């Protein structure tokens, strides 16, 4: 039968007032004979009506996928409100309901540290600019890089790792040609997290 998944908003979207955080309800394997789905959305059990439900799309096996997207208020997500998607179909005797909310627990402020390339890596054609982010809770976080007021997109970030004191850490690695680094360009690690002032901090790294 049809199964339902409910996805949380992107961490950055809940934190930055310039973005729109959304919760996403996905139902898959809707049969071909009963192609129609109805979504009901709830915030702390109270039905809401502002969802964007697009029409169902046929997949390979002739079954149907159906997506509904609910935009949520930044402060409601951060304040722990509970978002529920209910999926109704004729092939189902009872509707399926999933529910999600923000990770519980006292938030903890990430400490952000930039680490320049070691002298040994300077012998290579490219070097690694490192951003260590440690001590944060919950694990929802966004990390980005820029230089000279322009985004740097050539970085990889590790998943959060649970540390022994109940907080998380990660590292973000920006690869740059050693020539750019040696010409003294300023690079910046930007971190977005609930427990940071303004939800935002930027740490610089330069030769």
């Amino acid at each position: 039968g049809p199964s339902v998944f409910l996805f949380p908003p992107k961490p950055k979207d809940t934190l930055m007032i310039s973005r729109t955080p959304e919760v996403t309800c996905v139902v898959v394997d809707v049969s071909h004979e009963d192609p129609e789905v109805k979504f009901n959305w709830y915030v702390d059990g109270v039905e809401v009506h502002n969802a964007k439900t697009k029409p169902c799309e046929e997949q390979y096996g002739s079954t149907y996928r159906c997506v509904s997207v609910l935009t949520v208020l930044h402060q409601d997500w951060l304040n722990g409100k509970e978002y529920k998607c209910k999926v109704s179909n004729k092939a189902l005797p009872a509707p399926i309901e999933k529910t999600i909310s923000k990770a519980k627990g006292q938030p903890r402020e990430p400490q952000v540290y930039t680490l320049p390339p070691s002298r040994e890596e300077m012998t290579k054609n490219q070097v690694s600019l490192t951003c260590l982010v440690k001590g944060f809770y919950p694990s929802d976080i966004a990390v980005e890089w820029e230089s000279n007021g322009q985004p740097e997109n050539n970085y990889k970030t590790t998943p959060p790792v649970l540390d022994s004191d109940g907080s998380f850490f990660l590292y973000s690695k920006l690869t740059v040609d050693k020539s750019r680094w040696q010409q003294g360009n300023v690079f910046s690690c930007s971190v977005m997290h609930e427990a940071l002032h303004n939800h935002y901090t930027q740490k610089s790294l330069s030769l």
Partner: protein, 34 residues
């Protein structure tokens, strides 16, 4: 992004003099009039 509005969002979010209704309205104002 506009750092002005992000600062105003955050200060409203954590203002202890605002209750949930007042906080929502002031955040809505920032969202809409930035």
């Amino acid at each position: 992004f506009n750092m002005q509005c992000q600062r105003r969002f955050y200060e409203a979010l954590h203002d202890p003099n605002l209750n949930e209704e007042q906080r929502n309205a002031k955040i809505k104002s920032i969202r809409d009039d930035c």
